[PDB]
Amino acid sequence: ERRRLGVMGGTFDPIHNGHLVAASEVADRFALDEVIFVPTGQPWQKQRKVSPAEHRYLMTVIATASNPRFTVSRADIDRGGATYTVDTLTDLRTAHPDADLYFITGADALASILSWENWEQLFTLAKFIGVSRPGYELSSDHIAHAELPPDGLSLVEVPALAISSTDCRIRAGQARPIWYLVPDGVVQYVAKHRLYSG
Amino acid sequence: RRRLGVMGGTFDPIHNGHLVAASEVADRFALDEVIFVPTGQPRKVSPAEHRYLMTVIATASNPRFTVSRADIDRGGATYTVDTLTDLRTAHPDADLYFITGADALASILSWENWEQLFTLAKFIGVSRPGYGLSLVEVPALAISSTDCRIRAGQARPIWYLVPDGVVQYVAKHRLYSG
Ligand SMILES: NC(=O)c1ccc[n+]([C@@H]2O[C@H](COP(=O)([O-])OP(=O)(O)OC[C@H]3O[C@@H](n4cnc5c(N)ncnc54)[C@H](OP(=O)(O)O)[C@@H]3O)[C@@H](O)[C@H]2O)c1
Ligand SMILES: NC(=O)c1ccc[n+]([C@@H]2O[C@H](COP(=O)([O-])OP(=O)(O)OC[C@H]3O[C@@H](n4cnc5c(N)ncnc54)[C@H](OP(=O)(O)O)[C@@H]3O)[C@@H](O)[C@H]2O)c1
Ligand SMILES: Nc1ncnc2[nH]cnc12
Ligand SMILES: Nc1ncnc2[nH]cnc12
C-alpha cells in the first residue's frame, strides 16, 4: 500500500482556520495519510508586501502542531528564487519516492500553475486538488486551456474558505479582532510581532 | 451605560462561525460583554445540558464572553421576549443588543410580543455574505451547525469548524453519530 500524501501549498499570510478546514476535508475525502503544508518561499509579486518567510513558516507550524496528520515543509522557503510548483513537487518526490502525491491549493492559484508551468512534469509528479470558497465560480474547463490528464484534477468547495488571509490582514491593520478566524497562538504571534499593524 | 450583547441560538453544535460573529459584533458596537444564551428545546435536538456545556467550552477563553442558562432553565418553549425580560431584570442598567442569525430575525414580527421586543433591546442580525434592526455580514458563518452534524454522523472530521474541546465533546458523547 503506497502512502498517500497531501501537499498543501500557500503563502499563508496568515494561515487561518479556512486553510485548516480545507486540508482536513481533503485528507478525509481522498484518504490521505498525511498533509504536508508548504509555505511559499518567494511568492509571485502582486501589485503588496508579504511577511518574511520565516514568520509565515512559524505561523504555519503553530497552526498545524496539534494535528497528528499535518506537518510543515521548508522546501519552498529553502529554495532560492521565486517559488514554482514543479520545483515544490520535485523536491517532495525526492523526499518521498514511494508516495502518491496530491497537490492542494486555492483554485485560482492552480489556474496560474497550469498556465505557466510544464504539464508533462506536473502530472508525472502528482494529482491536483483545487479548493474554493462559496460563490467562487470556476469550472474545471476554465481552470485550464486544454484537456487535463485522466484523474489528474479534482475540485472541492470548502465553505470555511469564505475566511481569507487578506481580510485577516486588513482587520489586524484596523485593530479589529481576528480571534476565531485565525488559530490561537497565531493570533498572538501576529500581534506581538506587529506583522500587519504597520 | 453598560452595553451587553445577547447571543441567542440553539448551538447544536456551537461552532467557530458563531464565535467569529460575536467577536465582530462586540467590536463594532463597542459591547462590554456578550452573553451567549442556548435556546430551550424539546429533527432530534441534543439535550440542553450538552448544548450549554459545549457553549461554555467554546467561550471559556474569551474574557468578554459568558453563557446564561436563562432559556434552558425557564422550562418549555423559548420566547425571546422572555429571554430579554429575564436579562433586563438581571442587568437593570444595561443597554441590551440581541444578536442572532439574520434568517431567524427575518420573522421577528411573528415572534411573541414584538412590541415589547423593540422596547427591551436593539437587534442585530448576523448573516453569511450574499444575504431597530442592524445587519452584519460575517464570512465565517458559511460554517453551519447543520453541516457539522452531518459530518459527525458520517464519521467525517469537524476539526477547525468547531472549537477544540467541542470536537472531542461531540465525539465522546456520540451526539450525532447514531
Ligand atoms: N500565481 C501564483 O501565485 C502561483 C504560481 C505558481 C505556483 N503557485 C503556488 O500556488 C500556491 C498558492 O500560492 P499563494 O497562496 O501565493 O496564491 P495567492 O494568489 O496568494 O492566493 C490565491 C487564492 O488561493 C487561496 N489559497 C492559496 N493557498 C491556499 C491553500 N493552500 N488552501 C486554500 N486556499 C488557498 C488564497 O486564499 P488566502 O489568501 O485565504 O490563502 C487566494 O484566494 C503556492 O503553493 C504557490 O507556490 C502560485
Ligand atoms: N418566538 C421567538 O421569540 C423566537 C422565534 C424564533 C427564534 N427565536 C430566537 O432566535 C434565536 C435563534 O434560534 P435558532 O438558533 O433556534 O434558529 P435556527 O432556526 O436553529 O437557525 C436559524 C439560522 O440562524 C443561525 N443562527 C442561530 N443562532 C445564531 C447566532 N447566535 N449567530 C449566528 N447565526 C445563528 C443558524 O445557523 P447555525 O445552525 O449555524 O446556528 C441558522 O442559519 C434564538 O435565540 C431563539 O430563541 C425566537
Ligand atoms: N485530526 C486530528 N486528530 C487528532 N487530534 C487533532 N487535533 C487537531 N486535529 C486533530
Ligand atoms: N477576544 C479575546 N480577548 C482575549 N483573549 C481571548 N482569547 C480568545 N478570544 C480572546
Side-chain angles (χ1 to χ4, degrees), chain A residues 48 50-61:
Chain A
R48 162 99 182 95
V50 181
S51 295
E54 297 300 340
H55 286 307
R56 298 184 286 102
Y57 173 65
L58 296 183
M59 288 189 290
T60 304
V61 171

Side-chain angles (χ1 to χ4, degrees), chain B residues 151-167:
Chain B
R151 294 183 60 86
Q154 293 172 346
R156 293 160 71 212
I158 59 174
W159 299 109
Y160 311 115
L161 294 169
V162 161
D164 195 51
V166 182
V167 174

Side-chain angles (χ1 to χ4, degrees), chain A residues 17 20-21 24-25 28-29 63-64 66-67 70 134 159-160 162-163 167 171 175-181, chain B residues 16 19-20 23-24 27-28 58-59 61-62 65 129 139-140 142-143 147 151 155-161:
Chain A
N17 281 327
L20 299 171
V21 169
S24 173
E25 168 63 15
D28 171 79
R29 186 183 303 221
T64 59
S66 67
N67 196 323
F70 292 173
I163 301 163
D167 278 2
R171 295 181 61 85
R176 297 167 73 193
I178 55 171
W179 301 110
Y180 311 115
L181 291 171
Chain B
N16 277 334
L19 300 169
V20 171
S23 176
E24 164 66 8
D27 184 66
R28 190 182 296 212
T59 60
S61 68
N62 195 318
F65 292 172
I143 302 168
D147 179 55
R151 294 183 60 86
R156 293 160 71 212
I158 59 174
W159 299 109
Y160 311 115
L161 294 169

Side-chain angles (χ1 to χ4, degrees), chain A residues 122-136 139-144 146-147 149-150 152-198:
Chain A
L122 283 171
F123 288 102
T124 305
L125 291 169
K127 291 187 180 76
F128 294 81
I129 302 174
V131 293
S132 66
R133 65 180 60 82
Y136 176 80
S139 163
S140 53
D141 278 355
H142 294 141
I143 200 178
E147 187 189 40
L153 168 66
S154 305
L155 296 173
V156 174
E157 178 164 11
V158 180
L161 286 180
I163 301 163
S164 68
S165 70
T166 296
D167 278 2
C168 294
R169 294 195 304 281
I170 297 177
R171 295 181 61 85
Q174 293 182 326
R176 297 167 73 193
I178 55 171
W179 301 110
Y180 311 115
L181 291 171
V182 167
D184 199 50
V186 180
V187 172
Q188 297 96 326
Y189 188 93
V190 166
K192 66 200 182 182
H193 291 288
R194 289 170 288 182
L195 298 184
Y196 317 117
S197 57

Side-chain angles (χ1 to χ4, degrees), chain B residues 36-43 45-58:
Chain B
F36 286 62
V37 190
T39 317
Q41 289 292 353
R43 175 63 192 115
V45 183
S46 297
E49 186 66 12
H50 289 310
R51 300 183 287 109
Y52 173 65
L53 289 187
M54 286 185 294
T55 302
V56 172
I57 295 164

Side-chain angles (χ1 to χ4, degrees), chain B residues 65-87 89-127:
Chain B
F65 292 172
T66 193
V67 190
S68 171
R69 291 185 64 91
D71 284 347
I72 64 170
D73 277 353
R74 195 173 302 110
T78 296
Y79 313 114
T80 294
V81 66
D82 292 343
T83 309
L84 291 176
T85 299
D86 279 350
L87 287 177
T89 293
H91 312 272
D93 305 321
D95 296 328
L96 303 179
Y97 292 75
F98 188 83
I99 312 159
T100 191
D103 285 340
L105 278 169
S107 59
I108 186 167
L109 294 180
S110 307
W111 298 9
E112 285 77 4
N113 202 351
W114 63 262
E115 292 93 340
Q116 183 69 4
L117 290 177
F118 285 96
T119 75
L120 287 165
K122 292 173 192 302
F123 287 87
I124 301 171
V126 290
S127 61

